[PDB]
């Protein structure tokens with residue numbers, strides 16, 4: 001009975017990656033970089049704040065599972081110290097907020113395990129998954145799931161509109177946010193899904 | 201196995217109210233007014249932004265149930281227009297963040313039903329329930345439950361610490377927030393509970 005709203009590059013499968021544990025450092029297509037505190041440079045480099053896709057496939061050295069979906073995850077890595085701000089992915093949809101409708105936003109959240117060239121992947125920065133109408137956060141899961149090194153869990157965000165919602169007709173949106181509340185301050189997302197169902 | 205952390209005036213039962221549907225307009229004891237955008241006047245009046253307790257007992261004209269707990273609920277009413285900011289209740293606890301511990305914060309959220317002297321109680325401003333360590337929001341439920349006129353639902357907020365959490369030893373805190381994202385822009389809370397359990 002719930003209808004899916006299509007999401008562009010919903011599984012971070014674009015771009016295609018050939019080598020397990022390789023990654024990009026440029027915003028994945030379908031998404032924009034959400035960067036209210038100007039943490040992410042326009043000219044991207046490894047080992048500085050960035051986002052992109054990572055190939056989590058057979059033989060990965062940094063996870064205890066494959067990607068939740070397909071080959072790739074999407075990641076946001078912030079090198080600034082905890083407390084410096086929040087950043088992540090945003091996607092504004094063509095779909096608009098409808099009255100007497102329940103929205104269900106689901107996304108898998110994970111993080112690296114282990115260490116790399118002296119940088120520990122122990123610890124987690126906190127995540128927030130947001131459903132938007134216009135620039136309003138209708139509903140969000142601020143860090144309620146415990147995200148273990150190298151593993152993913154599914155976040156569920158729900159919003160129910162009324163017949164007189166202030167935000168009716170505004171574009172729906174999704175944000176996937178690195179809260180930078182601790183280190184290691186990289187975070188992964190995959191398999192974004194959004195459904196709509198009329199209320200009874 | 202989960203241990204309760206005591207909360208002062210956890211059910212907004214203080215002060216005691218004699219008459220059903222009567223209310224106070226002063227901060228309930230045990231709590232402070234969270235008011236980052238300076239919406240709430242120090243000199244309180246009815247029909248302006250305020251908070252207090254309300255007696256939701258037999259014969260109430262504005263609910264479809266009694267208070268979730270005891271006689272009273274705690275409310276936050278904001279008369280400013282949607283988008284003006286957020287405000288609510290805060291309580292900072294003596295308890296501090298411990299390592300390898302799961303925290304479970306539960307609170308009932310509700311709102312008035314009907315109308316009063318020309319002001320409609322239709323609509324809802326959005327809620328957020330926050331668990332803090334120091335000034336950090338560890339975990340929050342931003343408006344995931346649909347809160348029907350005159351009824352309450354239970355919000356659950358969870359956080360799991362690590363052995364190296366940045367915020368270990370900082371005071372735990374609770375915020376109960378009116379998001380002022382729509383009107384009618386009054387919101388109720390009751391029956392605040394916080395438990396701790398060691399992780400396996």
Ligand SMILES: NC(=[NH2+])NCCC[C@@H]1NC(=O)[C@H]2CCCN2C1=O
Pocket residue numbers: 021022023025045046047048050053054055056073075077116119186
């Ligand atoms: N292949 C993956 N699953 N993820 C790639 C993560 C890349 C991300 N950005 C970087 O520049 C590297 C530097 C070291 C840690 N990194 C990160 O955490």
Ligand SMILES: NC(=[NH2+])NCCC[C@@H]1NC(=O)[C@H]2CCCN2C1=O
Pocket residue numbers: 221222223225245246247248250253254255256273275277316319386
């Ligand atoms: N008795 C209750 N359950 N709630 C009392 C709510 C009081 C709160 N504050 C006020 O000043 C009144 C003005 C009209 C609407 N009010 C509100 O919503």
Ligand SMILES: [Ca+2]
Pocket residue numbers: 011012013067068069070071072073190191
């Ligand atoms: Ca994927």
Ligand SMILES: [Ca+2]
Pocket residue numbers: 211212213267268269270271272273390391
């Ligand atoms: Ca009570």
